[PDB]
Design a protein around this motif. Structure first.
Motif, PDB file in Angstrom:
ATOM      1  N   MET A   1      -9.823  -0.136  -1.542  1.00 53.84           N
ATOM      2  CA  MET A   1      -8.676   0.251  -0.733  1.00 53.84           C
ATOM      3  C   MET A   1      -7.597  -0.823  -0.806  1.00 53.84           C
ATOM      4  O   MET A   1      -7.868  -2.009  -0.600  1.00 53.84           O
ATOM      5  CB  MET A   1      -9.101   0.482   0.715  1.00 53.84           C
ATOM      6  N   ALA A   2      -6.372  -0.402  -1.097  1.00 55.25           N
ATOM      7  CA  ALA A   2      -5.256  -1.313  -1.278  1.00 55.25           C
ATOM      8  C   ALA A   2      -4.194  -1.078  -0.211  1.00 55.25           C
ATOM      9  O   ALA A   2      -4.156  -0.035   0.447  1.00 55.25           O
ATOM     10  CB  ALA A   2      -4.643  -1.156  -2.674  1.00 55.25           C
ATOM     11  N   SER A   3      -3.328  -2.075  -0.049  1.00 54.77           N
ATOM     12  CA  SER A   3      -2.238  -2.046   0.924  1.00 54.77           C
ATOM     13  C   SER A   3      -0.923  -1.977   0.154  1.00 54.77           C
ATOM     14  O   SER A   3      -0.484  -2.971  -0.432  1.00 54.77           O
ATOM     15  CB  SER A   3      -2.290  -3.266   1.840  1.00 54.77           C
ATOM     16  N   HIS A   4      -0.301  -0.803   0.151  1.00 52.76           N
ATOM     17  CA  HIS A   4       0.947  -0.588  -0.563  1.00 52.76           C
ATOM     18  C   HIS A   4       2.120  -0.551   0.411  1.00 52.76           C
ATOM     19  O   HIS A   4       2.004  -0.098   1.551  1.00 52.76           O
ATOM     20  CB  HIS A   4       0.886   0.708  -1.370  1.00 52.76           C
ATOM     21  N   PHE A   5       3.268  -1.043  -0.062  1.00 52.17           N
ATOM     22  CA  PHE A   5       4.440  -1.148   0.799  1.00 52.17           C
ATOM     23  C   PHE A   5       5.092   0.209   1.039  1.00 52.17           C
ATOM     24  O   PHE A   5       5.574   0.479   2.146  1.00 52.17           O
ATOM     25  CB  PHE A   5       5.450  -2.129   0.196  1.00 52.17           C
TER      26      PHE A   5
END
Lengths: 97, 121, 74, 101, 55
Positions: free
Chosen positions: C55-59
């Motif tokens: 799981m990634a944190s995208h802007f």
């Protein structure tokens, strides 16, 4: 040939559990007639069929919009090797001579 | 036919090869360890780089699952029979993971029992 | 018809090109004052995906394919 | 119940005649309140087919006939007798159906 | 999304896909009686079924 291999091994396993199998060639179908309620892309399986018939292991046959397999001793042996089936399985089509 | 884990690891890696597996490198390896699918693994030894081995160990210690360590791990991958693509090329396999239960759901073999013994003691 | 001379516009496209390290360093994140791996990213309750998906944190926007919640950093 | 019907259908006349011979033989075996055969009209369908795929030559519409012929028999009889009469390895080509309405 | 990426177009009047099945063509199909055979094979198997000409 771009179908994920799980469907490939499933098709090979059902093939050897049943023997020959039928093929309908069309891209406009949503879901396979016999393999319904699964949403399997037909194009990939068609490419697999033409690849195995071009690879030289089941005698390639184009018969008027409806395709069948060509089972033989060599074809059955190659399918056994390719699917690594146990050395105890015999097809149900040869029952009771 | 010596009944020991060292010789049957060739068969266990053949099973990991043909039956899914192929968790070479980082890819396809976390599935077995974060889900507790693999309760017995095989790890490459004599490594110049601590990065991959230490990341594998960290993933294992996330649930503290033991691993099988053998030497000459490249001969194993030579003996797995990985030619494939009809008869095109001679590739080699760097690592693989034994997924779902100690042994797969296919043929019952002696390798499952020997690796059960290895995991037990 | 005649051959269009298909070189004036898009003669042929090539496969996707990416730069990836042989052993992943971007998917796992270090530096959390722990001797072992620490998972700072909050786990999503959607288990329909694969186990190896990180799981990634995208802007901006979401790229998941099935659920695609809405959130921001502010 | 005494309401059983049989419908036989074929495109041939002599086949229907030999089937009626079978039925009259069965009626000769024992006299029963079985009515005579019902001769449905000779039911014709026309089909018409152009032959020249591309327009080249005459408009020779192949005119083919499909004339189906139907015979009915309604029987008030014990089941065993008529079953033995009928199930006697019937001739191929004539289609028989037993109906209970 | 996924419904526009692929297969956003059906054909509910399809005759080409649901054409005469036994051979590989679309033309020569009439939808009565379930023919699914071209006129050339219609004649080639006419008398076999019981077809006769008197007109």
């Amino acid at each position: 040939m771009l179908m994920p291999k799980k469907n490939r091994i499933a098709i090979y396993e059902l093939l050897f559990k049943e023997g020959v199998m039928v093929a309908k060639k069309d891209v406009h179908m949503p879901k396979h007639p016999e393999l319904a309620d699964k949403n399997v892309p037909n194009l990939h399986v068609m490419k697999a069929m033409q690849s195995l018939k071009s690879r030289g292991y089941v005698k390639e046959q184009f018969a008027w919009r409806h395709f069948y397999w060509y089972l033989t001793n060599e074809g059955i042996q190659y399918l056994r090797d390719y699917l690594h089936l146990p050395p105890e399985i015999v097809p149900a089509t040869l029952r009771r001579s | 036919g010596v009944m020991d884990v060292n010789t049957a690891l060739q068969e266990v890696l053949k099973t990991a090869l043909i039956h899914d597996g192929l968790a070479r490198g980082i890819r396809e390896a976390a599935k077995a360890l974060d889900k507790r699918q693999a309760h017995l693994c095989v790890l490459a030894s004599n490594c110049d780089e601590p990065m991959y081995v230490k990341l594998v160990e960290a993933l294992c210690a996330e649930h503290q699952i033991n691993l099988i360590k053998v030497d000459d791990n490249k001969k194993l991958g030579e003996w797995v029979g990985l030619c494939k693509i009809d008869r095109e090329g001679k590739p080699r396999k760097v690592v693989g993971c034994s997924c779902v239960v100690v042994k797969d759901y296919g043929k019952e073999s002696q390798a499952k029992d020997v690796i059960e013994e290895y995991f037990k003691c | 018809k005649k051959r269009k001379k298909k070189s004036y516009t898009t003669p042929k496209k090539n496969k996707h090109k990416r730069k990836k390290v042989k052993l992943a360093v971007l998917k796992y994140y270090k530096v959390d004052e722990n001797g072992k791996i620490s998972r700072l990213r909050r786990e999503c309750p959607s288990d329909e995906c694969g186990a190896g998906v990180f799981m990634a944190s995208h802007f901006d926007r979401h790229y998941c394919g099935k659920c695609c919640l809405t959130y921001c950093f502010n | 119940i005494h309401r059983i019907r049989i419908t036989l259908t074929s495109r041939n006349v002599k086949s229907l005649e030999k089937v009626c011979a079978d039925l009259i033989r069965g009626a000769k075996e024992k006299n029963l309140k079985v009515k005579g055969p019902v001769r449905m009209p000779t039911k014709t369908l026309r089909i018409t087919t152009r032959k020249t795929p591309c327009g080249e030559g005459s408009k020779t519409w192949d005119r083919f006939q499909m004339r189906i012929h139907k015979r009915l028999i309604d029987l008030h009889s014990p089941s065993e007798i008529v079953k033995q009469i009928t199930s006697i390895s019937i001739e191929p080509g004539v289609e028989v159906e037993v109906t209970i309405a | 999304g996924h419904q526009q990426l692929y297969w956003s177009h059906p054909r509910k009047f399809g005759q080409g896909s649901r054409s005469c099945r036994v051979c590989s063509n679309r033309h020569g199909l009439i939808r009565k009686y379930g023919l699914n055979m071209c006129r050339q094979c219609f004649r080639q198997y006419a008398k076999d079924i019981g077809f006769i000409k008197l007109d």
